[PDB]
Design a protein around this ligand. Sequence first.
Ligand SMILES: Nc1nc2c(ncn2[C@@H]2O[C@@H]3COP(=O)(O)O[C@H]3[C@H]2O)c(=O)[nH]1
Ligand SMILES: Nc1nc2c(ncn2[C@@H]2O[C@@H]3COP(=O)(O)O[C@H]3[C@H]2O)c(=O)[nH]1
Lengths: 396, 396, 396, 396
Amino acid sequence: TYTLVWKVWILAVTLYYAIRIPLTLVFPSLFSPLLPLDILASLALIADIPLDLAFESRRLLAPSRLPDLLAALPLDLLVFALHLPSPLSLLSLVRLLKLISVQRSATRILSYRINPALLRLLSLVGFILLAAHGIACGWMSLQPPSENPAGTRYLSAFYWTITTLTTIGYGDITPSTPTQTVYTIVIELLGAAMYGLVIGNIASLVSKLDAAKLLHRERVERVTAFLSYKRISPELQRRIIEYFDYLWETRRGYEEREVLKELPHPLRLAVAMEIHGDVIEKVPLFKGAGEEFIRDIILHLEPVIYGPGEYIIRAGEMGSDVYFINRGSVEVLSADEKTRYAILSEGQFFGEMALILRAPRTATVRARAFCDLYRLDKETFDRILSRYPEIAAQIQ
Amino acid sequence: TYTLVWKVWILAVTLYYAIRIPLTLVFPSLFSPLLPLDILASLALIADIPLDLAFESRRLLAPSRLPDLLAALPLDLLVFALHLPSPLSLLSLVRLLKLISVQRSATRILSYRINPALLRLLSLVGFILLAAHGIACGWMSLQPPSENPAGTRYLSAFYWTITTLTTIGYGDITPSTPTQTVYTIVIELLGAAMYGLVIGNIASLVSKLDAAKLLHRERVERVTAFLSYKRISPELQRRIIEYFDYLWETRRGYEEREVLKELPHPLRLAVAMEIHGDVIEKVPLFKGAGEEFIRDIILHLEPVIYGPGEYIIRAGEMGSDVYFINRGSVEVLSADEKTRYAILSEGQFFGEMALILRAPRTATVRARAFCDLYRLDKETFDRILSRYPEIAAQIQ
Amino acid sequence: TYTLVWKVWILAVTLYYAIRIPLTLVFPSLFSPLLPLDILASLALIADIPLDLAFESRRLLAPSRLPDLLAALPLDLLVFALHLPSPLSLLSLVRLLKLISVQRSATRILSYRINPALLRLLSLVGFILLAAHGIACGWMSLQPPSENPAGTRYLSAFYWTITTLTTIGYGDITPSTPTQTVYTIVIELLGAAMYGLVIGNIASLVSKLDAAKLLHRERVERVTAFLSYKRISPELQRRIIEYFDYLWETRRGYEEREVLKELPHPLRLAVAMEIHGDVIEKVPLFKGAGEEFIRDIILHLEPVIYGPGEYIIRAGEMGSDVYFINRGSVEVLSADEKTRYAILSEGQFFGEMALILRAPRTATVRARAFCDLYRLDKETFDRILSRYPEIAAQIQ
Amino acid sequence: TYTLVWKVWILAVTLYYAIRIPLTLVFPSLFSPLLPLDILASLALIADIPLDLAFESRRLLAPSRLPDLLAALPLDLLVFALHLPSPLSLLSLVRLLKLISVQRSATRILSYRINPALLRLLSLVGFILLAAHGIACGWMSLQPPSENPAGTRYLSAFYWTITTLTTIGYGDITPSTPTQTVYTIVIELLGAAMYGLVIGNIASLVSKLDAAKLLHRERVERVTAFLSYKRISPELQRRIIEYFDYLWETRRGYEEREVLKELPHPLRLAVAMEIHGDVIEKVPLFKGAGEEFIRDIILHLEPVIYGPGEYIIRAGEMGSDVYFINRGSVEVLSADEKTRYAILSEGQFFGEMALILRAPRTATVRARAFCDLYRLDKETFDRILSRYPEIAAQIQ
Ligand SMILES: Nc1nc2c(ncn2[C@@H]2O[C@@H]3COP(=O)(O)O[C@H]3[C@H]2O)c(=O)[nH]1
Ligand SMILES: Nc1nc2c(ncn2[C@@H]2O[C@@H]3COP(=O)(O)O[C@H]3[C@H]2O)c(=O)[nH]1
């Protein structure tokens, strides 16, 4: 927590040089009442690399280290103190190689807090404005010298380098000399490239913007276009469509057994233990068993979703499996579907007299709303029951 | 159904303010014979938030609620009644924060009726025109004052703010003062950003436009480029290609067992019951069985597709499985493939003397057109037959 | 084959109207020595709809039929014969609704011959040029009338409507009147929209251009970045990389068992019969078996790929499975890897004394180049051998 | 290694013609003191096609060969020696068809060293600059003839053809004649097309730029948005999130059993042998077994990842499986979780008294950091142990 303020300070220092250096190459009337900030920022840039090594790499010559090395040394201040000429002063731009280090720091200190496409887009907008400043300083540099206030002759140059980079091109102020025209051609290429990069990053940002909502929309029309071929009845097709509308608006389209298959075994055990915690210590058949038994029955529960009105259990069937209610409600009717016995709710269960006995179903269990209930098969229970002899004697 | 007309009314009210307010900031000669519409619309905006709470959230200070709160209060009408000056009148634009609420309402009331990329594109076109109006009003505001009809001095400003935002840039009318030039730079940035967003949304809209037809086109060339490596004969390769052309033009490329695996168990049971309804109550071996038997044989049927001329059953083979015709036709030939016994059609079946007996095939069953027929294996039938003793005695 | 020439004729007729009608709205000095082509093309458009019904739909009021219906009737020729004025002549553009029918015909008569993105891009380029003609005619229409040759006053208008639609915007010739300026604003919107559609279709065309070569490139770096974490030796890692280079440059990256799983059972049987045809009728253990036996052993062969130098069979091992060579070569060495017994090639086999006997390996079988050989497990052979009693007696 | 220098020489020769030929069509005052380079380069182009056949195709009339054939012959030098006129000289551009051969050579000699989208983008930038030269030569050609230095009248033409292709369009220098205007329209179309191709390739380049980091970011929010529906506790949810942060920052998001399933059987055996090499020759139960035994136990090990504090083995449980530590550390506690017995590290193992015996767990094994350990089930060990009788007698 005390290296992040140092990274913010280094970002401020390099942003300071990025605004100041091409502005003082044009005007040498600056730098003279402003040298102490150069002193402070140069000491900061030369002292960052020991703190770049220690407390940053443990917790000096590399192909991914030398921009910071070339940015560290005071290659500037010699130019502005000794009045080096125009084709030789330009090496004071070597401090601008520091921005690669700040890019590479910012693309990992907050890379998973925010979207990687959005971070790249914001970094590109920052570099484009910060480069439009330098291009405006260059255009202001190679103008014919005339008496003009230093605000207005910068304002026209910045207006020109925004008109050229965004490819609008009013053409109200144009090149005159050939040495202006070569500079104009090369920044037309750079402006078209930057605007292509911006359109590419926005196209990569809004393409993946709705993927969960588009994948579900494709999966819901694949089933519909298939069942229209099979000449299905429209009522059942409407029931399937309202099932998918439920499954989108509750758990966002994702199937249960394919989400918690991407967890390892102890975390999947922990999630299933947290889910079926207030349910499994209620049945009067698993009481008195060990903790070894509950962890093995709790990993073989299978989720199903019954719509409103679906017959879970018909009276008079064979019947094999027990059902644990998790979210919805359900009702229990008689064999003639008239006399309501009772109503069940979440945290309860039904069908427990099927794991131990070969009796046929004794009632009709109809769903009321969407249920989201789990089930346990008789074969799976007796398969993982064969290795526990004490409960194998308990159920007999 | 009576809240949707209220949402349409609120959209009309906020669109009314979005057109009117920057137009009356430039011309104070309006608002005076037009105050009653302000009264009606302000009452509507201040009375929407009780109906935003009740009958909308049940069926007041939140980070996703405060734009509607700041849009609700009559922060306007005080400016236009008391003649507040130019840098202070601009807070009458706070009503324009209402558009966030209308965006968030419209992106969920009709989000699955239409395409989410198309909805975002239409909303962006709406916001771009509705913002081009305000930018034209701003450009018309900071002009040098001269006698000019109020239609033409708006028409040139709207022509300018469309020439700048779409990045054409004729340059026939340009900035003159510095305070115009700063405004021109900032809306050049906004225009390049909006046009990047439009190109990005169109690129995300037409990329996923043919996905079902492109996925099948990739799957049909992956098989062809693989079988060209194996040095396959061109006749069988042409038969595979016409198989995939059939499977595209009938059920749109999708495989049967991977479409109805994305349904839950009761809906998959209901779909299979609707498909094999007029077929399974015709065989003279499953008649007299229970409803528990039919629901378990109907879930283990496996679809296959035979091309025109494919040998389904050769006379003299071992033979294990029964076949149920669903869509196409098929013919039955003798052992020498000469004397046609009969012809079968949809709704019928063949091979029923293989589930119960160890006799060899008694004829040759050749397909005629594309068949789309289901089959049932003998091992699967006898596996799910072992738990039903009465039909296990019936077949003996 | 004789309806395609009629579709080409209808495309020529509607392209004729699309070039001619806005050009003759500006110049009424045409149409008079050119009426017979109108007669022929109008008869063609009114006679296409019986051939649109018969021999096209079997092999009259619908929401996808009425553009052809409105294009069929001679709503034109009345305007140009009776000299209808300017705001009323424009309904002669209703013939231009025929292009929807030609679009919908061309997007299905050759939809799978070529790429669906490329077809949409070419159709959009056609519509953009064909609309730039009409927009040029409109700009030429609402000019101030002056004596000027009819080639040059069209050439400047077409130059303007290409400068505006491609968003270059030289600005050398501009609007003058307000009624020109409104037309300029609306086609600036249309030009920005069309150029957004072109960039979107090119971005959707070149994104999926290399998918087979990019998917393999991702799969080859996922394995490398994983095995670099496990601290693997660089020699084996180089051998894995040259394996993937082989598997790209021969069968284009695709795995064998996931390509021919997307075929149905009879076509998969036919492909496996064509592959293992000149191989399986060579072993002296399957000779004398039936055709029922070969079709069941041929569906359980499993492909493996051995690199140059990989030990297939080590002398002295347990050994269970037989190997069928398909593409590469292999060599057979002794127990001390010195005395070469023989060399094998494609179409041959080795390890046949493992299906019938519990003897240990008798030699060392080293690969020489990449082999691409199939294998058959002993358990699978004896599992599908248990149901054939005669070969079960033959092998004993 | 000595054909790559020849390909570089041919690329240099065709780049030489691509710069020189349209520049000498405008100025016939060249070519005369510069013919010997034409002689050398023409001999190179006519002698490349024998080395294109031999040592390139083995290691003459084809639809993918004839551009090189038409580029080979000296169709030039006759024009510049005999002073052919303007509409007939243009066939000297046929040498420019050589660039297709260089494109097709470069798109395969270094196609998997670098990114296929990046290669296409760099090739398009090369072709766009190399075509902007020729378009500038054409614009310079059809100018009104006036005395002007040959550097400046080229510099304005290149400035114009960069202003038009990047769609900026200052409009400072414009067409004058109609024959200039037709050329301007056709290169406006070409410039809009090229800039659409550049934006499309950048949009296809930066879309797939972070796929491994975006796929993991989607998989980590799918689990979180699902477990928020199940009303899970925030502490376990934080533990799941830090698990996924570990699994990203170590092995880049990929699951173990789905990476080395995309290898064939001998390479998967070799990778597992390299991983479990310094581990399996340490247990005092597998010592004295054969090499046939180790290769079969080493293919059935299953990876699991325990977080810091997860109970691997609880004292008093049933217990079945043995665990092999690979990367992390683990600690062994007593039944009351107080007295630390020992600490284990990588290369070691625990739980070996579970494969042979039906005793219950004798301690508590808690993880300390992230472990990355493999396990072997008792049922799998005894299943692959049943076919080896000597170790089946050794364990008793
Ligand atoms: N008969 C009966 N069963 C009930 C009642 N309430 C819940 N159930 C459950 O409904 C189940 C349906 O018959 P089961 O044999 O599956 O076991 C039954 C009970 O577990 C009730 O009031 N009467
Ligand atoms: N009891 C005991 N077990 C240990 C010790 N160090 C490692 N272990 C392993 O811890 C395992 C836990 O009990 P096991 O029966 O699985 O087998 C035990 C040993 O293999 C130790 O000091 N004491």
